[PDB]
Design a protein around this ligand. Structure first.
Ligand SMILES: Cc1cc2nc3c(=O)[nH]c(=O)nc-3n(C[C@H](O)[C@H](O)[C@H](O)COP(=O)(O)O)c2cc1C
Ligand SMILES: [Cl-]
Ligand SMILES: [Cu+2]
Lengths: 144, 59
């Protein structure tokens, strides 16, 4: 219901705090709630892995895990699930939010949902778009 | 608490703290994170954020 102005940006994203237990969600956009069918109250303080399910590729999930441990960006495509159990393909991009000194403070994660796995030009376009979305979220947060 | 409750008061505090204009982004995010970790302290955190906001008024 009550979203911060950052969470009203009309793209799917969450932001997590790696210094809280289990690197949990501290912001989630209204669009993300509509896509996934979760309420904000039931996902604040929770790690985003609940979006996965039985068909999610574990090698892809380990790639995300390895990037988070490296404190870097990553981009992958994986199967996710709404609260009611409906599958969707998620072209997903993670990137750290750093302070001026370069230290990681938070992670931004952006989701581009589709019914099908994307490849070739469609994949390139989608990767460009989610990267721009993450950059725009970072800029919106930091703006003076 | 063994179980954090995100009541109407806390959720409202997220919006109000985030909207304070004289905080920097690090402070806004730190307060939102603190609310997430201890939502029972919403009134106290909101009060502290508002104090900081007035202290950091542009001149
Ligand atoms: C900012 C952020 C956003 C994330 N968004 C998603 C997501 O949309 N879908 C997903 O399956 N995992 C997402 N994850 C990944 C999981 O939170 C977790 O990192 C992954 O499952 C690996 O850790 P685990 O093996 O402990 O589950 C996100 C992670 C972060 C930090
Ligand atoms: Cl994580
Ligand atoms: Cu592919």
């Amino acid at each position: 219901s009550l979203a911060t102005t950052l969470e009203r940006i009309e793209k799917n994203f969450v932001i997590t705090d790696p210094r809280l237990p289990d690197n949990p969600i501290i912001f989630a956009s209204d669009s993300f709630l509509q896509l996934t069918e979760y309420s904000r109250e039931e996902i604040l303080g929770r790690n985003a892995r609940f979006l996965q399910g039985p068909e999610t590729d574990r090698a892809t999930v380990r790639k995300i895990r390895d990037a988070i441990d490296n404190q870097t960006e990553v981009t992958v495509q994986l199967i996710n699930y709404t609260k009611s159990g409906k599958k969707f393909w998620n072209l997903f991009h993670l990137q750290p939010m750093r302070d001026q000194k370069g230290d990681v403070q938070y992670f931004i994660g952006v989701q581009l949902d589709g019914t099908e796995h994307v490849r070739d030009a469609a994949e390139r376009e989608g990767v460009m778009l989610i990267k721009k979305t993450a950059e725009n979220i970072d800029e919106a947060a930091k703006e003076l | 608490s063994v179980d954090n409750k995100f009541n109407k008061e806390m959720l409202s505090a997220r919006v109000e703290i985030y909207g304070l204009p004289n905080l920097n982004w690090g402070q806004r995010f730190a307060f939102i994170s603190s609310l997430t970790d201890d939502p029972s302290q919403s009134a106290n955190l909101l009060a502290e954020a508002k104090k900081l906001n007035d202290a950091q008024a542009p001149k």
